[PDB]
Design an enzyme around this catalytic site. Sequence first.
Site, PDB file in Angstrom:
ATOM      1  N   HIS A  41       8.346  -2.921  -4.612  1.00 40.62           N
ATOM      2  CA  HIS A  41       6.930  -3.248  -4.422  1.00 40.62           C
ATOM      3  C   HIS A  41       6.698  -4.739  -4.081  1.00 40.62           C
ATOM      4  O   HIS A  41       5.564  -5.121  -3.808  1.00 40.62           O
ATOM      5  CB  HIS A  41       6.056  -2.778  -5.598  1.00 40.62           C
ATOM      6  CG  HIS A  41       6.280  -3.538  -6.868  1.00 40.62           C
ATOM      7  ND1 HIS A  41       6.799  -2.923  -7.993  1.00 40.62           N
ATOM      8  CD2 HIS A  41       6.055  -4.843  -7.149  1.00 40.62           C
ATOM      9  CE1 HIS A  41       6.843  -3.868  -8.926  1.00 40.62           C
ATOM     10  NE2 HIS A  41       6.433  -5.044  -8.451  1.00 40.62           N
ATOM     11  N   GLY A 143       3.892 -11.385 -12.159  1.00 40.46           N
ATOM     12  CA  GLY A 143       5.029 -12.217 -11.781  1.00 40.46           C
ATOM     13  C   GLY A 143       6.287 -11.916 -12.590  1.00 40.46           C
ATOM     14  O   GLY A 143       7.381 -12.362 -12.220  1.00 40.46           O
ATOM     15  N   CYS A 145       7.579  -8.888 -12.929  1.00 39.86           N
ATOM     16  CA  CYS A 145       8.293  -7.798 -12.271  1.00 39.86           C
ATOM     17  C   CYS A 145       9.647  -8.267 -11.733  1.00 39.86           C
ATOM     18  O   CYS A 145       9.773  -9.422 -11.349  1.00 39.86           O
ATOM     19  CB  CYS A 145       7.438  -7.104 -11.214  1.00 39.86           C
ATOM     20  SG  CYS A 145       6.219  -5.936 -11.902  1.00 39.86           S
TER      21      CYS A 145
END
Lengths: 304, 304
Positions: A41, A143, A145
């Site tokens: 993503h 942030g 992830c």
Amino acid sequence: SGFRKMAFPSGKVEGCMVQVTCGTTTLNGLWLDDVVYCPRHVICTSEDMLNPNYEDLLIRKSNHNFLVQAGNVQLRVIGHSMQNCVLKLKVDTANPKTPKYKFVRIQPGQTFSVLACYNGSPSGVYQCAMRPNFTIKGSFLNGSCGSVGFNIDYDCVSFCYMHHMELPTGVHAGTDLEGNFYGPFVDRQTAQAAGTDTTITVNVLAWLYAAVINGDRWFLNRFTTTLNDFNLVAMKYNYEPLTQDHVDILGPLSAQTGIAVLDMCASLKELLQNGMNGRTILGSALLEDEFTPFDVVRQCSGVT
Amino acid sequence: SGFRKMAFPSGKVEGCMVQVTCGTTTLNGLWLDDVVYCPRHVICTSEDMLNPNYEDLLIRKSNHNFLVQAGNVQLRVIGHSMQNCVLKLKVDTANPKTPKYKFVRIQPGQTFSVLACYNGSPSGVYQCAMRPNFTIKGSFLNGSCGSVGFNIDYDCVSFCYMHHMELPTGVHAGTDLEGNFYGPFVDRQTAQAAGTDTTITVNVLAWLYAAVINGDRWFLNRFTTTLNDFNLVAMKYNYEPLTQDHVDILGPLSAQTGIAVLDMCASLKELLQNGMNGRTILGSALLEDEFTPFDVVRQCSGVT
Ligand SMILES: *CC(=O)N1Cc2ccccc2[C@@H](c2cccc(C#N)c2)C1
Ligand SMILES: *CC(=O)N1Cc2ccccc2[C@@H](c2cccc(C#N)c2)C1
């Protein structure tokens, strides 16, 4: 003595963290050998996340669109591919800090350490358990992830988790390092409820053994029980059913303490039925389930 | 979102751990620049610990009696001296992994991460608070002596603790990196009781603010209180008296949430007087006091 929610030393993992940027999106990547692993993503904007077609979005991305920065040095991207929900960015330099590592897909009930990161920089480390409903109760902001979960066996890092998502309930979902989600979760901005979170019975029993070893013994009683009697109580209190496999793994702790596994089950039964009546066990006022039987032995023996 | 007892990434500290052996005693040392710091009781046998005369015992030790091993490489000892309860072993090689560092003597109520070590090898990392009675509730077995506590400000490690001792109560005592013990403790195998362990009120309030930010709000009430009214309740429940300094440090959390510090104090007063009635706050069934107001802001903002 003393007993703590201890995470693994994170040094070996910090040396693998990098920042990955694609378009206006920045997250963390894992650099091992000449490959950087990150959530797919990274190629989306929040606008795209509502219903992304990852294969179509990726077609518009070239190697030069993926900016990978290791601390302050830029990595040259020579290849990219999607594996399930992760992207693998082939770089022209092998990470000189790559530890001996493995990718493992953990079972629910198993524990691991998370190195929470922001913009490729580590912020902290904490110990987690993969819930029976395949979520983790972590600490992740935007942030975060691409932050990873791992276990360490002497010199070998077994990466088991990559953080992808936060459910509207505040619990966390992610993948193993092959990009396969734990549980039924998809990488999309959609309401996905997690199932019933049950208590990891074998871990609570392991923690009760850690308690006895360290001096907290008030909960020991004159009773015993059977696996079937105990499971009737486990089912009412949304505890996982205890099997002979669980009893077998508790064997070493039973041997060390001299308290038979079914006797410890009778203590847990009484604690479930009566509560703790204002008392604590290892400084906790609830029954702790995020220590596996392996964690208890490792902590109580001093494994480095 | 989500809130966890998070330790600092330990990488910078793992690169400083070494093994120090003297005679038949082995413990951990801290290698920074060309100096290795370790507890002075490395020169004792358990026989000596009953009433050691450290100055007399040290006279029988030469540079060559201190074996310092960094992982698997032996360090050459070119000097030794005693500073309070620590030994400083001058080595002929500066640690190439020395981070930017400081030695700080923390205040009671402040928090820090501990990298528990055995034979110079890191086993785990956990977050601690220096208790108001100057003890820590850690996890330390034999061979853990010399493990250090630290904080990290971007690239600078502030070492604040070195582990020396375990009280007969199972709680832990140690020194700052200048060898001065926290509290009244001495490095001797003698019964030394720690004082009344009070609850760090400013940390509980900080954690209640962390709770509101992350969604746990049931404990908020329609009441307010005053510093003096609140302290009458704090004194009965062995909580530290709250001062205007404490209120000032809670300022940012009060501003972020819109809940006035004295309103949060009224919530804490009711939780102290009524208990939690079977409910939890951030997955805990007791009032957590090992998060400073700084830790709450750092965790809730994503500081790396
Ligand atoms: C965890 C994290 O850092 N982020 C930020 C981000 C950046 C770009 C695209 C998506 C995200 C979200 C996110 C939203 C919805 C679903 C997922 C998944 N999988 C991630 C989280
Ligand atoms: C914490 C630790 O590793 N050890 C082992 C050890 C080894 C040699 C000498 C003393 C010790 C003890 C110990 C006993 C009594 C007092 C202190 C202090 N200070 C340490 C602990």
